[PDB]
């Protein structure tokens, strides 16, 4: 009756009652408060996934079954895409969580085709180092209207009056313009926009590269890293389109794993 | 008689006299001092490449021919590999300059197969933001013995007592451990090691991904970003090996473009 994806930073909960979902999030830091909540419900089985699933299972007396997050994510995302009118033959999905995991879905199953440590954790952690802000809403709100111009170097900055070998407006070097602007006021907003910029550019670069390798035009982006971060969504969407791919975002995409755990548990029951 | 690769951060000069090379570097910031030097030599032709080639050409009266850096880099690197006893049938080369450009060499010619703004410029620029150090030797020396443990999150930190779906020692999130260590002394050395860490991990991830796509085990790493940066070299080499590829570094690899410009100019002369 409950699906829980207990990830590196957020615990995603999907409560099912009367054929409708109720979505909840809690910080993984507060995992004990998830157990508290569970102990006040009338749940007969936990469908778990994610790195911290074992911690919940070992701290509560409710029967639990654990599912590997890659398969749970892929299944929940498949459900959400169909619910939302997308009938895709294949796609890359990039799960931009605490870190970023990349998968190719061929129409039937997923395989992991790469990963990178540039994701939501870097946004928070490097963000804190450059701004001293710990609150996620404060951090991301501050970043939205930051100006990356004095921090990031573009191809045209290097090639100047010469026509460049690749488009001039492309980022050549994240943070590569800093040393050209050493008298600049590197504001917290500007610095944080550059952090979101580099995370978005790296994720998208990897996603479009495996899209080419596995011969799909479709890239689906999920993960809580996009929550309250319109800038990140735009950086990713824009570059995806520029490189000839189609980006998709999913309503409640961050809950793919939790939805997938519930579904996998259902269909685990069979016999031969 | 002179090959010059005038890049985003360094100007690489190869002087040829009596069948032996003389290598020089100057900061692109100091491009006027390269023109000064040129005006004191007895050079009859400049073989130029790189983003700032046009600037040198327009500020001096010596005849000049310009070559596209991707082809000049590939050619000079081919020469250097053979000089150094490597006879490779194919390879990826990653040019880790101010930014990073990735190429597949099939045995005959190169094509660019990707790029990313994580490279030497980010090391300097983000390094400056986290440390206030502008001097490259100071910056990189400070980073060498930094401890990334309190800054970077590993897969085992998320999965804890549960066997993880990918190896536990892998970086899950660059800077992802910062919020778990908010009372930590984030020393300049530690912060800079993490900057070098993320740049190395992203470059290597992209290089091994295009190596798989283009079916080669060989990855050659060039660029001045490796100079005075043993940590970067190690981060890259280690992960390359872990992902089943063979890393190569090249003596004077940073001068590939300059060597290639000289060679291309030579052989541009022909007729039909
Ligand atoms: C670990 C995962 C699956 C946990 O999922 P969550 O993010 O949903 O909690 C996720 O964060 C992830 O896939 N992270 C990226 C892991 C990865 O592929 N790293 C790449 C990498 C690249 C280079 C490296 C390195 C690791 O170790 C040393 O050098
Ligand atoms: C521009 C180049 C060729 C100049 O050579 P140098 O570094 O030798 O001076 C080199 O720095 C390079 O290839 N840089 C990386 C360029 C790149 O591929 N960027 C990727 C990228 C990724 C995402 C982006 C984006 C650009 O613009 C907006 O979103
Ligand atoms: N309320 C929040 N608190 C903290 N981080 C948040 C919040 N909402 C979104 N995020 C972002 O989402 C990231 C986690 O994404 P998620 O897909 O839940 O990863 P995981 O499965 O690793 O928990 C965080 O690192 C952060 O960037
Ligand atoms: N003496 C130096 N001064 C500045 N940067 C240096 C120096 N030596 C090495 N570097 C590093 O090398 C990077 C530039 O590499 P390079 O291959 O020369 O790029 P480009 O062709 O863009 O000039 C710098 O961003 C820096 O990280
Ligand atoms: Mg997750
Ligand atoms: Mg260069």
XYZ file of C-alpha atoms and ligand atoms in Angstrom:
658
model
C 0.000 0.000 0.000
C 3.056 2.306 0.196
C 5.971 2.726 -2.172
C 9.133 4.351 -0.792
C 12.228 5.396 -2.708
C 14.725 6.221 0.021
C 17.446 8.014 -1.896
C 20.671 9.798 -0.999
C 18.919 13.123 -0.227
C 15.122 12.669 -0.352
C 12.759 9.969 0.651
C 9.909 9.796 -1.863
C 6.670 8.281 -0.677
C 3.684 7.211 -2.799
C 0.550 6.423 -0.793
C -2.172 4.567 -2.708
C -5.787 4.852 -1.513
C -8.901 4.396 -3.702
C -6.986 4.233 -7.028
C -5.382 7.692 -6.480
C -1.827 8.609 -5.482
C -0.748 10.782 -2.591
C 2.837 12.003 -2.917
C 5.092 12.863 0.046
C 8.732 13.848 0.458
C 10.946 13.814 3.531
C 14.685 14.454 3.865
C 16.800 11.316 4.076
C 18.423 13.101 7.067
C 15.010 12.691 8.747
C 14.565 8.970 7.982
C 13.476 8.364 11.608
C 10.473 10.658 10.971
C 9.436 8.438 8.039
C 9.432 5.453 10.420
C 7.368 7.523 12.900
C 4.836 8.276 10.146
C 4.761 4.639 9.008
C 4.049 3.508 12.577
C 0.874 5.698 12.611
C -0.578 4.160 9.406
C -2.384 0.871 8.741
C 0.052 -0.485 6.134
C 0.422 -4.225 5.616
C 3.465 -4.120 3.288
C 6.292 -1.740 2.333
C 7.493 -1.676 -1.254
C 11.010 -0.252 -0.956
C 13.772 0.914 -3.279
C 16.769 3.251 -3.157
C 20.009 3.273 -1.158
C 18.388 3.770 2.233
C 15.622 1.146 1.822
C 17.511 -1.248 4.119
C 17.522 1.346 6.947
C 13.712 1.670 6.865
C 13.248 -2.094 6.596
C 15.474 -2.817 9.615
C 13.792 -0.149 11.826
C 10.138 -1.156 11.393
C 8.033 -4.336 11.960
C 5.981 -4.072 8.747
C 6.785 -6.704 6.079
C 8.957 -5.159 3.341
C 10.170 -6.130 -0.111
C 13.086 -4.346 -1.746
C 13.531 -3.663 -5.474
C 16.618 -2.404 -7.337
C 16.190 1.294 -8.050
C 17.142 1.161 -11.748
C 14.349 -1.270 -12.615
C 11.897 0.425 -10.207
C 12.700 3.865 -11.739
C 12.361 2.561 -15.295
C 9.003 0.902 -14.554
C 7.448 3.872 -12.718
C 8.635 6.237 -15.448
C 7.096 3.969 -18.133
C 3.778 4.191 -16.262
C 3.974 7.989 -15.876
C 4.881 8.552 -19.561
C 1.826 6.572 -20.701
C -0.458 8.301 -18.171
C 0.782 11.627 -19.583
C 0.161 10.771 -23.287
C 3.698 9.805 -24.286
C 4.021 6.545 -26.212
C 7.782 6.449 -26.887
C 9.393 3.535 -28.780
C 12.697 4.139 -26.961
C 14.589 6.777 -25.007
C 17.462 7.681 -22.753
C 16.385 8.545 -19.249
C 18.620 10.648 -17.026
C 17.849 10.342 -13.339
C 19.242 13.582 -11.918
C 19.212 12.725 -8.223
C 21.893 13.339 -5.623
C 24.031 12.066 -8.492
C 23.121 11.319 -12.096
C 22.414 7.858 -13.555
C 21.838 7.364 -17.318
C 19.799 4.582 -18.884
C 18.741 3.377 -22.301
C 15.226 2.013 -22.562
C 14.803 -0.014 -25.773
C 10.995 -0.379 -25.510
C 11.097 -3.419 -23.183
C 13.753 -2.958 -20.505
C 16.379 -0.528 -19.260
C 20.143 -0.841 -19.031
C 22.427 1.649 -17.325
C 24.697 3.181 -19.959
C 26.540 5.705 -17.774
C 26.573 7.993 -14.818
C 28.225 11.131 -13.443
C 28.563 12.804 -10.028
C 27.240 16.107 -11.370
C 23.671 16.370 -10.081
C 21.629 17.721 -7.197
C 24.227 16.973 -4.534
C 26.829 19.104 -6.328
C 24.276 21.909 -6.676
C 23.718 21.910 -2.889
C 27.325 21.235 -1.848
C 29.268 23.443 -4.201
C 26.436 25.975 -3.792
C 27.051 25.994 -0.037
C 30.817 26.470 -0.544
C 30.227 29.500 -2.808
C 27.266 31.044 -0.922
C 27.031 29.618 2.657
C 23.317 28.883 1.966
C 22.092 25.532 3.323
C 18.368 25.948 2.641
C 17.475 24.343 -0.724
C 14.608 26.775 -1.566
C 16.796 29.795 -0.687
C 19.709 28.402 -2.699
C 17.795 27.625 -5.856
C 15.667 30.853 -5.698
C 18.899 32.882 -5.379
C 20.401 31.182 -8.463
C 17.470 31.795 -10.861
C 18.368 35.305 -12.010
C 22.142 34.991 -11.661
C 24.293 36.203 -14.552
C 26.888 33.657 -15.742
C 28.605 36.078 -18.192
C 31.592 37.109 -16.043
C 32.159 33.513 -14.884
C 31.732 31.333 -18.016
C 33.925 31.502 -21.129
C 32.324 31.021 -24.603
C 33.903 29.803 -27.829
C 33.657 33.308 -29.328
C 35.750 34.692 -26.415
C 38.627 32.480 -27.500
C 38.188 32.813 -31.304
C 37.263 36.576 -31.235
C 37.136 37.934 -34.840
C 37.853 34.487 -36.374
C 34.943 32.234 -37.365
C 35.133 29.337 -34.848
C 35.194 25.580 -35.678
C 32.087 25.044 -33.531
C 29.345 27.596 -32.757
C 30.606 30.740 -31.055
C 27.866 30.940 -28.411
C 28.700 27.513 -26.926
C 30.195 27.409 -23.426
C 33.920 26.721 -23.962
C 34.878 26.625 -20.266
C 32.667 26.704 -17.210
C 34.156 29.229 -14.751
C 36.726 30.000 -17.514
C 35.945 33.728 -17.588
C 36.609 34.308 -13.844
C 40.270 35.170 -14.349
C 39.266 37.747 -16.993
C 36.997 39.453 -14.392
C 39.083 39.467 -11.220
C 37.737 42.887 -10.136
C 34.167 41.584 -10.638
C 31.666 41.297 -7.828
C 31.104 37.545 -7.978
C 27.673 37.697 -6.419
C 26.096 34.652 -4.777
C 23.350 34.701 -7.444
C 25.887 34.756 -10.274
C 28.066 32.016 -8.733
C 25.064 29.744 -8.110
C 23.764 30.207 -11.648
C 27.207 29.025 -12.856
C 27.027 25.934 -10.569
C 23.607 25.047 -11.945
C 24.992 25.792 -15.409
C 27.900 23.353 -15.219
C 25.738 20.571 -13.674
C 23.113 21.015 -16.396
C 25.639 21.173 -19.241
C 27.479 18.014 -18.102
C 24.265 15.984 -17.570
C 22.929 17.034 -20.949
C 26.219 16.396 -22.733
C 26.308 12.849 -21.371
C 22.636 12.245 -22.144
C 22.921 13.425 -25.783
C 26.100 11.386 -26.233
C 24.473 8.082 -25.134
C 21.352 9.047 -27.156
C 23.598 9.104 -30.278
C 25.373 5.892 -29.280
C 22.083 3.994 -28.749
C 20.326 5.660 -31.724
C 17.399 7.368 -29.987
C 16.197 10.984 -30.300
C 14.271 10.911 -27.021
C 15.698 11.978 -23.673
C 13.493 11.868 -20.558
C 14.742 13.823 -17.544
C 13.666 12.862 -14.000
C 14.893 13.523 -10.472
C 14.122 15.966 -7.716
C 17.077 18.155 -8.850
C 14.596 19.927 -11.177
C 12.216 20.885 -8.326
C 12.223 24.652 -7.736
C 14.924 24.970 -10.358
C 13.560 26.429 -13.577
C 17.113 27.507 -14.597
C 18.352 23.922 -14.523
C 15.339 22.768 -16.551
C 16.043 25.476 -19.127
C 19.799 24.808 -19.374
C 19.041 21.106 -19.984
C 16.084 21.563 -22.352
C 17.861 24.202 -24.441
C 21.051 22.195 -25.024
C 19.089 18.972 -25.634
C 17.159 20.760 -28.432
C 20.340 22.398 -29.794
C 21.881 18.918 -30.195
C 18.881 17.629 -32.166
C 17.219 15.599 -29.402
C 13.776 15.853 -27.808
C 13.667 16.539 -24.049
C 10.787 15.323 -21.889
C 9.929 16.208 -18.340
C 7.477 14.162 -16.375
C 4.878 15.356 -13.848
C 5.894 13.657 -10.591
C 8.920 12.180 -12.411
C 10.887 12.272 -9.132
C 8.500 9.634 -7.782
C 9.181 7.129 -10.616
C 11.094 4.757 -8.271
C 8.358 4.769 -5.612
C 5.625 4.148 -8.187
C 7.762 1.417 -9.773
C 8.276 -0.326 -6.409
C 4.503 -0.560 -5.878
C 3.969 -1.891 -9.410
C 6.845 -4.407 -9.202
C 5.566 -5.731 -5.892
C 2.096 -6.250 -7.458
C 3.368 -8.263 -10.355
C 6.015 -10.179 -8.439
C 3.079 -12.442 -7.503
C 2.680 -15.148 -10.108
C 3.249 -18.840 -10.568
C 4.152 -21.372 -13.216
C 60.168 27.857 -39.115
C 57.806 28.477 -36.160
C 54.583 26.758 -35.191
C 52.248 28.617 -32.817
C 49.092 27.316 -31.178
C 47.528 30.422 -29.672
C 44.886 28.967 -27.392
C 42.414 30.355 -24.872
C 44.967 30.405 -22.009
C 48.445 29.515 -23.331
C 50.342 30.247 -26.453
C 52.430 27.210 -27.396
C 55.453 27.818 -29.561
C 57.569 25.221 -31.389
C 60.838 26.576 -32.783
C 62.583 24.314 -35.304
C 66.351 24.674 -35.805
C 68.704 21.924 -37.069
C 66.084 19.117 -36.942
C 65.429 19.656 -33.184
C 62.481 21.297 -31.426
C 62.589 24.126 -28.931
C 59.372 24.457 -26.932
C 58.099 27.735 -25.438
C 54.950 28.819 -23.621
C 53.550 32.283 -22.999
C 50.214 33.346 -21.500
C 47.584 34.310 -24.052
C 47.115 37.390 -21.802
C 50.655 38.332 -22.909
C 50.104 37.857 -26.664
C 51.844 41.207 -27.334
C 55.038 39.721 -25.827
C 54.872 36.866 -28.361
C 54.785 39.472 -31.151
C 57.760 41.237 -29.500
C 59.689 37.945 -29.480
C 58.719 37.178 -33.086
C 59.976 40.605 -34.182
C 63.466 39.745 -32.784
C 63.776 36.469 -34.764
C 64.633 35.757 -38.409
C 61.430 33.878 -39.287
C 60.158 33.819 -42.861
C 56.755 32.198 -42.166
C 54.361 31.642 -39.246
C 52.407 28.406 -39.075
C 49.443 29.311 -36.866
C 46.535 27.530 -35.205
C 44.219 28.062 -32.237
C 41.609 30.696 -31.374
C 44.036 33.595 -31.106
C 46.005 32.860 -34.314
C 44.229 35.731 -36.097
C 45.426 38.229 -33.440
C 49.093 37.302 -34.008
C 48.665 37.309 -37.786
C 47.094 40.790 -37.834
C 49.772 42.318 -35.525
C 52.925 41.213 -37.366
C 54.373 41.625 -40.916
C 55.636 38.037 -41.283
C 53.694 35.874 -43.781
C 51.332 33.527 -41.907
C 49.176 30.525 -42.733
C 46.413 29.387 -40.404
C 45.278 25.792 -39.812
C 42.188 24.519 -37.964
C 43.221 23.373 -34.502
C 41.437 19.996 -34.585
C 43.367 18.793 -37.633
C 46.613 20.443 -36.437
C 46.233 18.790 -32.981
C 45.456 15.387 -34.493
C 48.460 15.552 -36.845
C 50.995 16.713 -34.231
C 49.745 14.082 -31.787
C 50.101 11.365 -34.472
C 53.729 12.452 -34.933
C 54.445 12.497 -31.179
C 52.855 9.056 -30.595
C 55.068 7.487 -33.278
C 58.190 9.288 -32.006
C 57.399 7.856 -28.553
C 56.951 4.206 -29.702
C 53.156 4.087 -29.872
C 51.707 2.603 -33.057
C 47.962 2.761 -32.314
C 45.372 1.551 -34.863
C 42.784 3.967 -33.429
C 42.004 6.014 -30.338
C 39.990 8.731 -28.690
C 42.006 11.822 -27.935
C 40.847 14.256 -25.271
C 42.364 17.704 -25.574
C 42.063 19.067 -22.036
C 42.760 22.735 -22.703
C 40.946 25.776 -21.366
C 37.983 23.569 -22.245
C 37.856 19.945 -23.350
C 37.449 18.714 -26.945
C 37.022 14.982 -27.735
C 38.001 13.295 -30.982
C 37.960 9.865 -32.558
C 40.943 8.992 -34.706
C 40.170 5.979 -36.924
C 43.768 5.454 -38.145
C 43.556 8.035 -40.967
C 41.752 11.161 -39.781
C 40.066 12.697 -36.755
C 36.480 13.755 -36.180
C 35.238 15.659 -33.154
C 32.804 13.436 -31.265
C 32.099 15.707 -28.284
C 33.239 18.363 -25.913
C 32.660 19.747 -22.419
C 33.485 22.975 -20.554
C 35.138 21.065 -17.712
C 38.879 21.527 -18.219
C 41.772 23.762 -17.242
C 39.760 26.979 -17.245
C 37.332 25.585 -14.658
C 40.276 24.425 -12.537
C 41.679 27.987 -12.487
C 38.351 29.836 -12.262
C 36.437 27.749 -9.778
C 39.761 27.294 -7.951
C 40.047 31.073 -7.615
C 36.458 31.340 -6.308
C 37.144 28.717 -3.605
C 40.720 29.766 -2.699
C 41.464 33.333 -3.971
C 44.672 31.938 -5.574
C 45.431 33.322 -9.050
C 48.898 31.821 -9.536
C 48.625 28.516 -11.460
C 51.673 26.847 -9.797
C 50.445 27.874 -6.316
C 46.918 26.679 -7.093
C 47.841 23.276 -8.437
C 50.588 22.659 -5.783
C 48.028 23.463 -3.051
C 45.527 20.953 -4.502
C 47.887 17.935 -4.694
C 47.522 16.668 -1.129
C 43.953 17.845 -0.548
C 41.504 15.378 0.991
C 38.221 15.025 -0.941
C 36.544 12.775 1.692
C 34.426 15.403 3.484
C 33.385 17.002 0.174
C 32.601 14.079 -2.190
C 29.838 11.507 -1.666
C 30.454 7.835 -2.666
C 27.950 5.156 -3.636
C 28.589 3.304 -0.357
C 27.570 6.449 1.607
C 24.115 6.226 0.071
C 23.725 2.402 0.114
C 25.425 1.903 3.562
C 25.005 -1.760 4.683
C 23.233 -2.761 1.426
C 25.284 -4.127 -1.481
C 25.063 -1.357 -4.135
C 24.010 -1.783 -7.812
C 27.339 -0.309 -8.948
C 30.668 -0.393 -7.063
C 30.536 1.224 -3.637
C 33.790 3.186 -3.951
C 32.607 5.144 -7.020
C 31.972 8.875 -6.612
C 28.166 9.219 -6.446
C 28.088 13.026 -6.146
C 30.908 15.515 -6.435
C 30.603 17.977 -3.523
C 27.691 15.767 -2.310
C 29.214 15.164 1.129
C 29.571 18.888 2.022
C 26.164 19.096 3.681
C 27.059 16.060 5.830
C 30.178 17.936 7.086
C 28.933 21.464 7.730
C 31.192 21.895 10.794
C 34.186 20.769 8.681
C 37.146 22.994 7.957
C 36.842 23.094 4.174
C 40.491 23.860 3.603
C 41.714 25.416 0.358
C 43.716 22.230 -0.353
C 40.667 20.018 0.153
C 38.368 22.250 -1.936
C 40.874 22.435 -4.807
C 41.392 18.672 -4.823
C 37.592 18.351 -5.235
C 37.629 20.837 -8.173
C 40.367 18.854 -9.888
C 38.414 15.711 -9.007
C 35.175 16.757 -10.698
C 36.988 18.068 -13.828
C 38.947 14.816 -14.130
C 35.927 12.577 -13.527
C 33.767 14.387 -16.120
C 36.506 14.414 -18.809
C 37.220 10.742 -18.255
C 33.548 9.774 -18.199
C 33.018 11.463 -21.562
C 36.197 9.985 -23.033
C 35.340 6.394 -21.991
C 31.782 6.836 -23.261
C 32.873 7.879 -26.796
C 35.575 5.151 -26.672
C 32.735 2.593 -26.245
C 30.593 4.256 -28.911
C 33.432 4.254 -31.490
C 34.770 0.823 -30.415
C 38.315 1.717 -29.348
C 40.158 0.803 -26.126
C 42.727 3.584 -26.488
C 42.372 7.040 -24.964
C 45.161 9.606 -25.434
C 45.088 12.612 -23.104
C 46.721 15.920 -24.120
C 46.512 19.546 -23.029
C 48.402 21.822 -20.703
C 45.805 21.138 -17.947
C 48.002 18.172 -16.906
C 51.124 20.340 -16.390
C 52.060 20.547 -12.700
C 48.959 18.546 -11.891
C 49.824 14.982 -10.938
C 46.447 14.646 -9.119
C 44.520 15.333 -12.314
C 46.666 12.831 -14.226
C 45.983 10.213 -11.552
C 42.218 10.842 -11.347
C 42.004 10.449 -15.148
C 44.363 7.470 -15.497
C 42.759 5.562 -12.621
C 39.167 5.875 -13.863
C 40.199 5.176 -17.476
C 41.768 1.869 -16.315
C 38.786 1.066 -14.053
C 36.486 1.347 -17.099
C 38.603 -1.086 -19.136
C 40.382 1.443 -21.363
C 44.073 2.231 -21.835
C 45.190 5.794 -21.018
C 48.161 7.396 -22.761
C 49.984 10.575 -21.933
C 52.326 12.159 -24.394
C 55.632 13.943 -23.715
C 55.055 17.491 -24.979
C 51.447 16.515 -25.803
C 50.356 20.113 -25.105
C 52.368 21.172 -28.157
C 50.531 18.809 -30.567
C 48.749 21.729 -32.322
C 51.961 23.727 -32.816
C 53.829 20.699 -34.171
C 50.850 19.882 -36.406
C 50.764 23.432 -37.824
C 54.419 23.163 -38.897
C 53.826 19.746 -40.479
C 50.605 20.810 -42.252
C 52.299 23.883 -43.678
C 55.120 21.668 -45.056
C 52.814 19.322 -46.855
C 50.333 21.938 -48.017
C 52.852 22.440 -50.850
C 52.050 20.088 -53.694
C 50.613 20.123 -57.172
C 48.604 17.990 -59.550
C 24.763 6.105 -7.025
C 23.365 6.429 -7.549
C 22.890 5.255 -8.440
C 22.395 6.622 -6.333
O 21.091 7.056 -6.764
P 20.348 8.435 -6.231
O 21.229 9.461 -6.847
O 18.992 8.238 -6.759
O 20.481 8.220 -4.773
C 23.433 7.748 -8.391
O 23.710 8.886 -7.548
C 24.523 7.677 -9.482
O 24.407 6.929 -10.439
N 25.558 8.484 -9.317
C 26.678 8.563 -10.270
C 27.679 7.401 -10.104
C 28.649 7.422 -11.271
O 28.353 6.833 -12.310
N 29.788 8.098 -11.093
C 30.735 8.266 -12.182
C 32.109 8.335 -11.776
C 33.000 8.959 -12.638
C 34.349 9.032 -12.320
C 34.806 8.466 -11.184
C 33.969 7.842 -10.335
C 32.635 7.750 -10.609
O 34.659 7.356 -9.254
C 36.000 7.822 -9.421
O 36.088 8.435 -10.739
C 36.350 25.735 -27.801
C 37.625 24.894 -27.833
C 37.619 24.042 -29.126
C 38.867 25.849 -27.811
O 40.099 25.110 -27.711
P 41.223 25.333 -26.517
O 40.464 24.823 -25.346
O 42.345 24.549 -27.046
O 41.386 26.800 -26.626
C 37.649 23.962 -26.575
O 37.824 24.729 -25.365
C 36.347 23.141 -26.444
O 36.077 22.260 -27.242
N 35.576 23.445 -25.413
C 34.310 22.750 -25.122
C 33.150 23.240 -26.013
C 31.964 22.311 -25.824
O 31.879 21.295 -26.513
N 31.069 22.662 -24.896
C 29.955 21.790 -24.565
C 28.759 22.472 -24.162
C 27.848 21.764 -23.391
C 26.656 22.355 -22.994
C 26.363 23.612 -23.385
C 27.220 24.318 -24.145
C 28.403 23.776 -24.555
O 26.710 25.565 -24.407
C 25.499 25.643 -23.653
O 25.242 24.322 -23.099
N 13.216 19.886 -0.405
C 14.449 19.557 -0.890
N 15.503 19.407 -0.070
C 16.726 19.085 -0.501
N 16.992 18.885 -1.804
C 16.022 19.004 -2.752
C 14.670 19.354 -2.333
N 13.916 19.410 -3.434
C 14.722 19.122 -4.492
N 15.984 18.876 -4.077
C 17.095 18.550 -5.021
O 16.951 17.221 -5.514
C 18.150 16.484 -5.280
C 17.813 15.061 -4.937
O 17.078 14.473 -6.001
P 16.459 12.997 -5.832
O 15.993 12.589 -7.223
O 15.444 13.012 -4.730
O 17.780 12.177 -5.391
P 17.981 10.957 -4.339
O 17.251 9.770 -4.920
O 19.448 10.818 -4.370
O 17.416 11.432 -3.009
C 18.861 17.213 -4.161
O 20.255 16.948 -4.187
C 18.501 18.647 -4.461
O 19.346 19.208 -5.464
N 51.787 28.350 -16.759
C 50.435 28.175 -16.817
N 49.591 29.212 -16.682
C 48.262 29.087 -16.733
N 47.666 27.896 -16.927
C 48.394 26.756 -17.079
C 49.849 26.840 -17.031
N 50.323 25.602 -17.203
C 49.252 24.775 -17.346
N 48.097 25.473 -17.275
C 46.755 24.825 -17.380
O 46.493 24.445 -18.728
C 45.251 25.001 -19.157
C 45.346 25.401 -20.601
O 45.672 24.267 -21.392
P 45.982 24.443 -22.961
O 46.017 23.031 -23.530
O 47.203 25.296 -23.129
O 44.655 25.235 -23.433
P 44.446 26.419 -24.523
O 44.750 25.814 -25.872
O 43.016 26.716 -24.321
O 45.390 27.544 -24.129
C 44.991 26.170 -18.231
O 43.604 26.468 -18.169
C 45.570 25.660 -16.935
O 44.657 24.812 -16.241
Mg 17.065 8.559 -6.484
Mg 44.307 24.372 -27.166
